[PDB]
Amino acid sequence: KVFGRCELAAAMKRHGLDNYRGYSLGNWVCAAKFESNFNTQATNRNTDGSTDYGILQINSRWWCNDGRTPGSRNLCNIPCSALLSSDITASVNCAKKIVSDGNGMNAWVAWRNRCKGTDVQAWIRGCRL
Ligand SMILES: [Cl-]
Ligand code: NA
Numbered sequence: 001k002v003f004g005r006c007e008l009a010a011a012m013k014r015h016g017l018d019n020y021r022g023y024s025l026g027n028w029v030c031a032a033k034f035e036s037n038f039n040t041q042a043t044n045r046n047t048d049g050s051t052d053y054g055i056l057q058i059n060s061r062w063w064c065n066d067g068r069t070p071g072s073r074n075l076c077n078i079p080c081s082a083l084l085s086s087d088i089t090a091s092v093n094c095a096k097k098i099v100s101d102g103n104g105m106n107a108w109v110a111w112r113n114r115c116k117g118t119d120v121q122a123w124i125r126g127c128r129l
Helices: 005-014 025-036 080-084 089-099 109-114
Strands: 043-045 051-053
Touching: 005 025, 025 109, 051 080, 080 089
Parallel strands: none
Antiparallel strands: 043 051
16 A cells, blocks of 8 residues: 555554654655555565565564564564555554664654654644645
């Protein structure tokens, strides 16, 4: 599923992301835009052999099991394919674990490089929330 900007904002808000660990909704929408272009089916392979999955590009090195990343952990306790669903519940629940691990949203490279320190409220402007 390819989300619309406001459709995703509303989905994330419903799932408890707004101001989660101090990160306003705009941060999450901005991260999703630049990680996956709002596409739940996005995958990208990393140099180390791990793969990033879904709307928030969650890494199989630490967070999910894809059966092909030797010596990796499965901290969210889910198959990586679950992160590709049109239902974002699994991705959000896992993101909550990631953002709580001490490094905040810096875990997401595109958030650090393209959202951090910008006017992120612009990403939810106009939306009915
Ligand atoms: Cl933080
Ligand atoms: Na893994």
